[PDB]
Structures are given as C-alpha cells and as structure tokens.
Design a protein around this ligand. Sequence first.
Ligand SMILES: COc1cc(/C=C/C(=O)O)ccc1O
Ligand SMILES: COc1cc(/C=C/C(=O)O)ccc1O
Lengths: 192, 192
Amino acid sequence: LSTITTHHLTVPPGLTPEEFQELSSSIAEFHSYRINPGQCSSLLAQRIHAPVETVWTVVRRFDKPQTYKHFIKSCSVGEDFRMTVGSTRDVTVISGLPAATSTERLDILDDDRHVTGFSIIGGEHRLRNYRSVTTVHGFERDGEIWTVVLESYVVDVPEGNTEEDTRLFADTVVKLNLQKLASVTETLAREA
Amino acid sequence: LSTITTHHLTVPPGLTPEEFQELSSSIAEFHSYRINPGQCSSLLAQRIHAPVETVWTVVRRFDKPQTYKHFIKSCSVGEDFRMTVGSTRDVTVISGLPAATSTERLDILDDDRHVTGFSIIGGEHRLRNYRSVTTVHGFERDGEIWTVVLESYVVDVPEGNTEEDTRLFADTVVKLNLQKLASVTETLAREA
Ligand SMILES: COc1cc(/C=C/C(=O)O)ccc1O
Ligand SMILES: COc1cc(/C=C/C(=O)O)ccc1O
C-alpha cells in the first residue's frame, strides 16, 4: 500500500548537513509525497551563490521554463496569461522522438515563502503523472550569502521500467536544469 | 542523391570568425561527411580556457566517456582493453526507457593531431547509425592560451521524425556534453 516519502529525513545530494538541519521542516512541509507501487520520488538540491530574490525571479517564471531548463524547444501560454495557480503552459520537449507537447499546470505560487510547483497533466513522454515542487532558501555565514534550491518530484514508473531506470533519468534532468539555474542566476547576480 | 556537408564553410555556433578561419582546413578534413536523404549532420564548437593537452587527456579516454558526457549509467570495455582503433565499449544510456546498451567502436585516435571519433554500431535508441568526430585545437593571443573543441556527427533521422527533431536533440546532447568537458578540463587546469 501507500508510503510517505522520506526526503525530509536524509541529506539530499548537493547539500551539507548544516544546510539540511535548517531546511528539514521545509522539506517535510513541501517535499513530502504519498507514493504508491509503480511510482518513484526524489529530492534534488543545488547551491547557488546569489541572493534568494535573484534566484526566485527565475524560478517563478512559469511561462519561461526554458530560462533555466534544457531540452525545451518552445513554451506557449497563450494570450491573457496571468501568473496564477491553475494556469497552464504547453511545453514542446526536445526528445529525438516526434514533436510532442507537455501540458503542465501551475499548482503552487508563493512569492513570500518562495515555493512553486507544477503537474504534467498531458503529454506522451517518459514522465507520466509528473508532479514537482521547487523551493528557494537563503543562507548566511559571516556576511556571506548564498541560496539553496530544493526540487522534488513524484512520477510514474512506466510499465517495463525499473524504478532505478526512471529515477536515474528524472534525477539527471532535474540536476542538469538546476545547474543551469545556478549559472543563469549567478550571472544575473554578478551583473546587478 | 548524396550531398557533402558544408560545416567547413560557415562559422559554427560557439566559435568566433577569427577562430573559424584558423580551423577551416581542419573542419573540411575531419568534420565533413557525405549525407543522404534521411540523415542529418551538424558541427558544434566549445571554447575551453585550458591547454590543448589538458583537454585532449579527457577527450581521448574512449573507455571513460562519462568523464565529460551526461546520461551515461555505466561504460564497460572488458578486460584486456587497449586504446586502439577498432576497440569497442558498451555504453548503458540513461533514457527513461528500459536499460539499453549502446555498442560503440573507436574509429580514429590521433594523439599528435588530437583527433578522435566513434561509431554507434548497435543499440536501440534514438541515434541509429551515429558517427562523430572530435578534434582539439589550441589558440593564443598575447601569451593567453585557450582551446577550441570541435565535434560533428552524422546520424539517421528516424521514420516519423523531422530532420529538425533529430538535429535539435543531437545538438543539445553534444552541446551539453561539451560544456561538461569545458568545466572538467578547466578545473583540471586550474588545479595543475
Ligand atoms: C524540460 O522540460 C520537460 C522535459 C520533459 C521530458 C520528457 C521525456 O524526455 O520523456 C517533459 C516535460 C518537460 O516540461
Ligand atoms: C551519452 O552517450 C550516449 C547517449 C545516447 C543517447 C541515446 C538516446 O537518448 O536515444 C546514445 C549513446 C551514447 O553513447
């Protein structure tokens, strides 16, 4: 039967024990899921040497995910789009397979606590019933500032796949996109 | 009927006109192919602030492509492997589809001119009949040194795909792997 994810109870890759103990409550609040057989979940972490609000300005741009994500041919949200929960975007993915769209819905948007998340509601790709949450957190040590971005997901393991198959693929993509987020926002910071 | 690729006649993305005019003969010599209908070819470029021999030490490691490539679960070359042309490696790719192997053959290995290339001879993935060449080149300006890596390929466009589909996917992967090559070798340089 069901199980609760345990991401809030171990140190995620890319994060220090010190940082974890500061975020353990945010991980349990926003990066916990109830998974069933046939699903897999993961938590990824990325340090960014940039202020929180700098990183969040990119993370929250639901209509321009290609700003920090790879493998996006285009993204459309149609006229009269507003940055509200329930809005959707059509993401055309670069996959070496025929041109297919991923319809995605904005699930969360908290400008004060820096939390967002989305769901893949349609699309013929390898991430069926995908749902993820991203949170942005600030850190300080002797007047030095940095940010930690946490991103988790739950997703179906396709029939004929191992959980390790799907998890390793999803982790790689998320991890790669967080490195681009780091570069983009650190450049934005070092340029003012 | 057949056509010759024209990569040696335009400035590839990631390279300056100055750099191109220096490499135009190497591009025609090593990065030209005869493509037929149903194939596509591309040339990618990446500047690396590291000496040529530093970048080449990684580029030539046919048995450890995960050193600078993404989406590789593992790579095996079996005992008694030697770095000779004709050798092969089994690359297990991270693709969100079931665990599948890419058998690849070393086509070129020139330690003096810094040229290597390989062919995908077996594997059920989106890069059928893939063949690529990588060359490493040195540059100088006022005692400052940098390297340019050029990587081209030819590959089949799968039935039901646009050429733009396949090219955009292959370009993204190669481009991403060259950025990792840049980071890895620049770190290797700045550490001696
Ligand atoms: C980068 O953004 C995305 C990538 C995918 C990838 C799907 C696959 O490779 O199966 C799907 C939806 C996305 O929004
Ligand atoms: C990173 O190295 C490789 C990636 C692939 C990808 C195949 C696909 O996604 O269809 C194939 C062979 C490789 O050596």
